[PDB]
């Protein structure tokens, strides 16, 4: 017997060498079975994307609700956001966020200095919501410095 | 349907093998671990 998701997620894929949908899981046993066959961040290509966001939420213009949203972001040393990366994606598919219908999917973007992790969020301007998202993503987390949100 | 982290993580090492309705097409192949099951 399979552990269903709450909402079913899409990882999506930036190729460098443009925004392609991977592969959709609904299941506990779906997601591991995924992710222990893609490259962690630490191993993927220099400008290269990897999202992961709720089933039918492109992160693309399309969807505006979460496009022109909050987006809270995370640097990490390059090759050491493996964990932050992991922890986040367990976070939201576990709907361990207490405002977790504000959240919309996760990216982890590789580049030659950093690696960033950002959460894409929905109502940017519920000031309550995106605390709460941004206190509890630190403490999931635990990261010593900079969690920064953006809203366009 | 929520899940703790640690719950989710034993799960992690029972499930290695590629969903066999995974397509790997050529130009996500540089997505793909180097060892895949």
């Not at chain 1, 949908?21 to 506990?28: A, D, G, L, R």
């Not at chain 1, 996760?106 to 709460?132: F, L, M, P, Y």
């Not at chain 2, 719950?7 to 066999?20: G, I, N, T």
């Amino acid at each position: 017997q399979p552990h269903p998701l709450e909402h079913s997620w899409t990882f999506w894929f930036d190729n460098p060498s443009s925004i392609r949908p991977i592969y959709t899981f609904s299941t506990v046993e779906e997601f591991w079975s995924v992710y222990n066959n893609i490259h962690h961040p630490s191993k993927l290509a220099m400008r290269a994307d990897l999202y992961c966001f709720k089933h039918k939420i492109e992160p693309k213009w399309e969807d505006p609700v979460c496009a022109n949203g909050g987006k809270w972001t995370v640097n990490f040393p390059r090759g050491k956001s493996d964990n932050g990366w992991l922890y986040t994606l367990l976070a939201m598919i576990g709907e361990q966020f207490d405002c977790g219908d504000e959240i919309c999917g996760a990216v982890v973007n590789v580049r030659s200095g950093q690696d960033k992790i950002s959460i894409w969020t929905k109502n940017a301007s519920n000031e309550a919501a995106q605390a709460s998202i941004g206190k509890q993503w630190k403490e999931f987390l635990d990261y010593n410095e900079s969690i920064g949100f953006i809203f366009h | 349907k929520k899940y703790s982290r640690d719950f989710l993580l034993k799960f992690a090492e029972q499930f290695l093998d590629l969903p066999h309705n995974f397509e790997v097409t050529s130009d996500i192949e540089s997505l793909m671990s180097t060892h895949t099951n």
